[PDB]
């Protein structure tokens, strides 16, 4: 009768070449009776399987993308499994989901946590600039962020509108 | 390792029957189990079909999976389509690795359910805005670091 719940934690922003550790706390089942996995998603590339670790935790599997860079593990006495992510690349930017297995498929999925890897782009050119020149670049960068945020608000405000009037009367 | 190919987009009219296809590129579609996941906008995927054709409890009868070996494909059939079914659908299978299809995007109350639906938009919007904040924090930090120096 227990509802299965998987909860990711960790993630966020990170530089390339550096590291991040994701966590998934699992509830509602006998943890060590089932494999755990990590699957990541982007809007254009869909779902990609990243890593799996067997029930007893003695066997690990990795997708081509992350072989030798990511390491999966689990602490059974803690009902948690981990994805250690090293040598991060820009293209590792994705929503990462944890997942439980049931022999032949993924039966339950986490909430998804966003990992943002910065470009490794060179910023040495900035040193010839003055504080005033550097501030003018900030004043140019923020209007472009604000435009992106405003188009999200508009996307959802047309989603809200029919619900809001259905409620009216 | 094989690939699972799904159409990018499918449209149907309400009440009709839609057949979402999932073709395997090499080897036999019937060699390994095929599963289907539904993902609504801003949400986690949930299982619609496991082991080729089994419905988890709570998945309505009008969802049914099958294997069409003649076209080396799996089919997620939806009878009497409702608007609530508009979502992304991913098939899934495996051999030595795990493979997901690219996903097919399908297009076609009382005050308490409406209120619940309205408020659910707020955490989804916030998550998208947070992604944007993190993206621009990457572009902003070299400038602020340059300023302190």
């Amino acid at each position: 009768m227990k509802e299965v719940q998987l909860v990711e934690s960790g993630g966020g922003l990170v530089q390339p070449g550096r590291s991040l550790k994701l966590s998934c706390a699992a509830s509602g089942f006998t943890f060590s009776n089932y494999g755990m996995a990590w699957v990541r998603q982007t809007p254009t590339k869909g779902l990609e399987w990243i890593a799996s670790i067997s029930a007893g935790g003695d066997k690990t599997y990795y997708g081509d993308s992350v072989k030798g860079r990511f390491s999966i593990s689990r602490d059974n006495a803690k009902t948690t499994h981990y994805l250690q992510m090293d040598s991060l690349r820009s293209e590792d930017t994705a929503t990462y989901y944890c997942a439980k297995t049931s022999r032949v498929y993924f039966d339950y999925w986490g909430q998804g946590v966003m990992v943002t890897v910065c470009s490794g782009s060179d910023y040495e050119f900035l040193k010839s600039w003055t504080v005033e020149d550097l501030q003018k670049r900030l004043l140019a960068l923020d209007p472009m962020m604000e435009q992106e945020i405003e188009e999200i608000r508009q996307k959802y405000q047309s989603k809200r509108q029919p619900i809001l009037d259905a409620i009216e009367a | 390792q094989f690939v699972l190919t799904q159409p990018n987009s499918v449209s149907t009219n309400l009440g009709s029957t839609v057949k979402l296809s999932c073709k395997r590129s090499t080897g036999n579609i019937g060699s390994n189990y095929v599963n289907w996941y539904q993902q609504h906008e801003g949400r986690s995927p949930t299982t619609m079909i496991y082991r080729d054709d089994k419905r988890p409890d709570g998945v309505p009868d009008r969802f049914s999976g099958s294997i069409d070996r003649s076209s080396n494909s799996a089919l997620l059939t939806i009878n009497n389509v409702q608007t609530e079914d508009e979502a992304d659908y991913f098939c899934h299978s495996y051999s030595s690795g795990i493979v997901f299809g690219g996903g097919t995007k399908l297009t076609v109350w009382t005050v308490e359910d409406l209120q619940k639906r309205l408020l659910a938009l707020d955490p989804m919007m916030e998550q998208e805005i947070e992604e944007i904040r993190q993206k621009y924090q990457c572009k902003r930090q070299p400038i602020l670091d340059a300023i302190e120096a």
Binding site: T30, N33, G35, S52, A55, K59, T101, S102 | -
Partner: peptide, 11 residues
Amino acid sequence: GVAMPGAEDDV
């Protein structure tokens, strides 16, 4: 029969 990689020990 063979289980999905990483699920070969599921009960």
